[PDB]
């Protein structure tokens, strides 16, 4: 019943383990172990659920353990201890074969084949911890263990590809405790978390591991954002070193989102436009990455309205994301109709929701944008208009006040007008026929250059797999 | 054949409370007769919500009688011979009753059976039309859409022009029913040449509808000819009030008589747009869209005009014109400004090489984005 | 003007009639719109074929 299923579960892990072990221990074929390792994680997280979750326990018992046994006891202790033949090494089915690891020679210290198996165990535990939702004692114990465990080693490039996954759960576990629950000690250990990420980051340039380095930069930036240290983030990214080379397009989407967020609040919207569009493209558009997508699409809209661009009303409608973008929809219209009072009520009403995503502080700036837009509508509709008429139109208090809005706006070229004091009216000045001018030349030039860059990317990618294939024997 | 479409077209009017209360109660007479005669009883229950047990007792009776007759007839037909032709013909007839009572579900079962069995190509197309017609009765866009796709597989195998007329017009109602007019105009002007009333709203309706769509879609010459130099519309005169109003509009647009344009615009709203089930939903966009087309047209021929001039021509006050113009301008079809203090109306003139430049880059921009999206995808492999 | 038979514009507040005998817009730019136009259809097709690979 129990015995049967546990065993079965055990077997499956063991099969997977041996294969990836073989690959690494038979020369550097780097890509193959890596692709395999990612898929195995999914597979392992999916497995656990059924065939019983004491697959782990069984496997620990039956290795040449160093302190995995000591760890495992801590894990069973949190969630109530049992004993049913769980004594360390109560299972011997290794039986002096190198394959499942020669029992005698490992103990003596003439071989140490425990190395990567311990690393792998830590990965299985982390993974199992977050799946389960086991916290407190374990998280702390786990963080504790693994940091000195890694610093015992002097990692290989292949072993670093593997801790490129372990640090994401380390980060995330610390956060869960900090997020549940107020402590002075949370605050204190936030400092220590940064410090270690930063140490590992210097090392991963020298080790030549693009994968690890990327991951660390994602984490560190995210850390600056939560505690609201914008200044810290702005300094950190400008010693830019983030590679797009070896990294998943999953990782690219996260990276570019952080870029966008920090630009947003200091009023740089030109750079933020491009990075944001890219993260949308980059992201795998699937059922459970849908959370990411939603958060992002709320930002992308903000960035646009701040720039002065007006997002479609069509977009929010035909999306399957309608309901969440209900507040958004109200802002888009409110800027369009140029009604200040409605804008003011709208952000107050939505205050709680907006505040979570912290887009709220952007919304407050959107108060200027309402007014400014109303002054463009008036310029387009009526080329020559007495300053008296605008005041009535936008409900603005006196002649002197409208003087002051147009005057600040035309510095930015939004309205693109000039006030004629003498005559007591305002003249639009954008009057087209820029064909005759040198202007289209400028425009096309950028397009031409952009094509060329797409060519070089295309040419480059295409040829590379053939090279590997052609060399290899093939029928 | 006739009751199939007529019941629904007539009942619509009664539903509406848009219409005058007085008009609403006159519709009630006609609709009421046909509820009882045709025994519309399941559906009627639905329809009472939206605004004598005998009808229904009658239903139970009729149903049972009819059922009982045909039942053992079809049970006798099974003992007996021919299953291709004669049983298929009876199975059509069960569906005919089901279509009478307003259950779309029960007609669809029986009429499918006919298709299954190996039948004449001519016969095939026929049966599929009827299934799709059941959708119109309720007016559902999703059901109609999918059925009419199949009809095209068989349409050229049969290769009859008889049923392809019916096909053209069915797809026409599906289009009219939704906002898009581009497609409708093209099928519905053609139905002027050839109409078949079979399970289809009478020719007079088609005359009126063809004219509305006409205006919205074709440019000057072509459109004018299609909605005027048509022999058919002249022969048919103005026999009902609704066809009159729309034609009056057409005359005034074309003739550039802009005094009478506005009175004619208001008439078409009351008597064409709202009686129409199809353009009920689209009343709002349509009437507004006409004010923009007409204004554009006057402006095209004029470098500059006065507000006082323009205002007078239409028959609105000077203030009114300004307000209504300020709606049209940022949306952009008029291509114009108003230099207000002076009271002159200027019309920006970038129609030239500059125009062609601006358009061409935007189209280039659209191709550029698609290339990136696709590029990036393959590149990951 | 609207039929187009001298195809000019009437300037109402200056009460002058401007006449332009300029023929229809330059051919070259219009022919570009047709070329770019085809290319959009080429790309839609190219992505469906490429869907299998992704």
């Amino acid at each position: 019943l129990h015995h049967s299923e546990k065993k079965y579960a055990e077997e499956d892990q063991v099969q997977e383990l041996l294969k990836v072990l073989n690959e690494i221990s038979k020369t550097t074929l780097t890509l193959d172990p890596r692709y395999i390792w990612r898929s195995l994680k999914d597979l392992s997280s999916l497995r656990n659920q059924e065939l019983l979750n004491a697959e782990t326990l069984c496997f620990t018992v039956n290795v040449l353990y160093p302190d995995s046994s000591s760890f495992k006891k801590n894990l069973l202790k949190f969630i109530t201890s049992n004993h049913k033949s769980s004594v360390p090494g109560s299972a011997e089915l290794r039986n002096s074969y190198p394959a499942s690891f020669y029992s005698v020679n490992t103990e003596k210290k003439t071989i140490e084949v425990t190395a990567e198996i311990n690393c792998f165990m830590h990965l299985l535990v982390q993974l199992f911890l977050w799946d389960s939702k086991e916290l407190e004692q374990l998280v702390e114990f786990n963080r504790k263990v693994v940091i000195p465990n890694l610093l015992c080693y002097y990692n290989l490039r292949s072993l670093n590809l593997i801790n490129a996954k372990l640090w994401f759960y380390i980060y995330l576990s610390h956060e869960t405790l900090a997020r549940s629950s107020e402590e002075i000690n949370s605050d204190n250990q936030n400092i220590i978390l940064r410090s270690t990420m930063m140490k590992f980051l210097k090392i991963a340039s020298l080790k030549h591991d693009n994968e690890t380095k990327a991951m660390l930069i994602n984490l560190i930036l995210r850390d600056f954002l939560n505690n609201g240290e914008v200044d810290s983030a702005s300094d950190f990214i400008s010693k830019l070193e983030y590679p797009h080379t070896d990294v998943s397009s999953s990782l690219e989407a996260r990276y570019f989102f952080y870029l966008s967020k920090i630009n947003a609040i200091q009023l740089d919207y030109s750079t933020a436009n491009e990075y944001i569009i890219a993260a949308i493209r980059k992201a795998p558009h699937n059922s459970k990455s849908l959370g990411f997508l939603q958060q992002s699409n709320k930002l992308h809209c903000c960035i646009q309205l701040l720039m002065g661009d007006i997002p479609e009303l069509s977009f929010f409608h035909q999306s399957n994301m309608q309901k969440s973008l209900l507040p958004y929809y109200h802002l888009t219209k409110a800027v369009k109709l140029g009604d200040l009072k409605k804008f003011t009520s709208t952000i107050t009403k939505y205050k709680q929701l907006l505040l979570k995503d912290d887009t709220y502080q952007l919304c407050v700036r959107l108060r200027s944008n309402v007014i400014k837009t109303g002054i463009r509508i008036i310029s387009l509709t009526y080329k020559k208009i007495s300053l008296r008429d605008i005041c009535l139109k936008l409900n603005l208090d006196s002649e002197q006040t409208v003087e002051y809005m147009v005057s600040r706006a035309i510095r930015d070229g939004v309205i693109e007008a000039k006030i004629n004091h003498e005559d007591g009216f305002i003249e639009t000045t954008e009057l087209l026929n820029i064909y005759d001018s040198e202007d289209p030349q400028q425009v096309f030039d950028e397009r031409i250059k952009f094509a060329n860059q797409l060519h070089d990317e295309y040419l480059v990618s295409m040829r590379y797999p053939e090279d590997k294939k052609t060399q290899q024997n093939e029928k | 054949r006739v009751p199939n479409y007529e019941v629904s077209e007539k009942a619509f009017l009664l539903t509406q409370s848009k219409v005058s209360i007085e008009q609403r109660k006159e519709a009630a007479e006609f609709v009421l007769a046909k509820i009882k005669e045709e025994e519309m009883a399941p559906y009627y229950k639905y329809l009472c919500e939206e605004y004598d047990q005998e009808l229904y007792n009658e239903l139970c009776k009729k149903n049972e009688s009819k059922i009982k007759e045909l039942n053992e007839k079809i049970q006798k037909l099974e003992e007996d011979d021919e299953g291709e032709l004669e049983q298929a013909q009876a199975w059509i007839n069960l569906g005919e009753y089901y279509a009478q009572i307003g259950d779309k579900d029960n007609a669809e079962k029986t009429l499918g059976k006919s298709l299954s069995k190996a039948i004449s190509t001519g016969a095939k197309i026929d049966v599929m039309l009827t299934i799709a017609r059941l959708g119109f009765f309720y007016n559902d866009q999703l059901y109609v859409k999918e059925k009419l796709e199949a009809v095209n597989s068989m349409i050229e195998k049969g290769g009859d022009w008889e049923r392809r007329n019916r096909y053209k017009t069915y797809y026409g109602i599906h289009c009219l029913a939704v906002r898009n007019f581009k497609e409708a105009a093209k099928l519905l002007v053609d139905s002027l040449a050839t109409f078949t009333s079979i399970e289809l709203t009478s020719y007079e309706s088609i005359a009126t509808y063809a004219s509305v769509t006409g205006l919205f879609t074709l440019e000057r010459t072509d459109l004018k000819s299609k909605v005027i130099d048509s022999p058919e519309l002249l022969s048919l005169i103005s026999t009902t009030a609704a066809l009159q109003s729309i034609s009056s509009l057409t005359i005034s647009l074309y003739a550039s008589d802009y005094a009478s344009y506005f009175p004619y615009l208001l008439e078409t709203y009351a008597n064409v747009l709202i009686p129409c089930k199809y353009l009920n939903r689209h009343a709002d966009f349509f009437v507004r869209e006409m004010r923009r087309k007409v204004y554009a047209q006057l402006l095209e021929s004029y470098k500059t005009l006065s507000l006082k001039s323009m205002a007078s021509a239409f028959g609105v006050s000077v203030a009114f014109l300004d307000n209504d113009l300020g709606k049209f301008i940022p949306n952009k079809q008029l291509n114009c400004v108003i230099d207000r203090v002076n009271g002159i109306v200027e019309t920006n003139r970038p129609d030239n090489k500059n125009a062609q430049y601006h358009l061409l880059v935007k189209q280039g921009d659209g191709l550029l984005t698609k290339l990136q999206k696709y590029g990036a995808a393959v590149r990951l492999t | 003007i609207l039929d187009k038979i001298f195809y000019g514009v009437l300037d109402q507040g200056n009460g002058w009639l401007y006449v332009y005998e300029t023929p229809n817009q330059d051919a070259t730019y219009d022919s570009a719109l047709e070329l770019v136009g085809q290319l959009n259809k080429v790309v839609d097709q190219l992505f469906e074929k490429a869907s299998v690979l992704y």
Binding site: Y458, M462, N473, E474, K475 | - | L46
Partner: peptide, 27 residues
């Protein structure tokens, strides 16, 4: 052409795999 080289490349992954099985018999 980008697409055409990638179809070819996908195909050859399978051929490379099977190649090994053929060599096993040969040895």
């Amino acid at each position: 052409e980008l697409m055409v080289i990638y179809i070819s490349n996908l195909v050859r992954s399978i051929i490379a795999f099977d190649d090994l099985i053929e060599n096993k018999i040969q040895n």
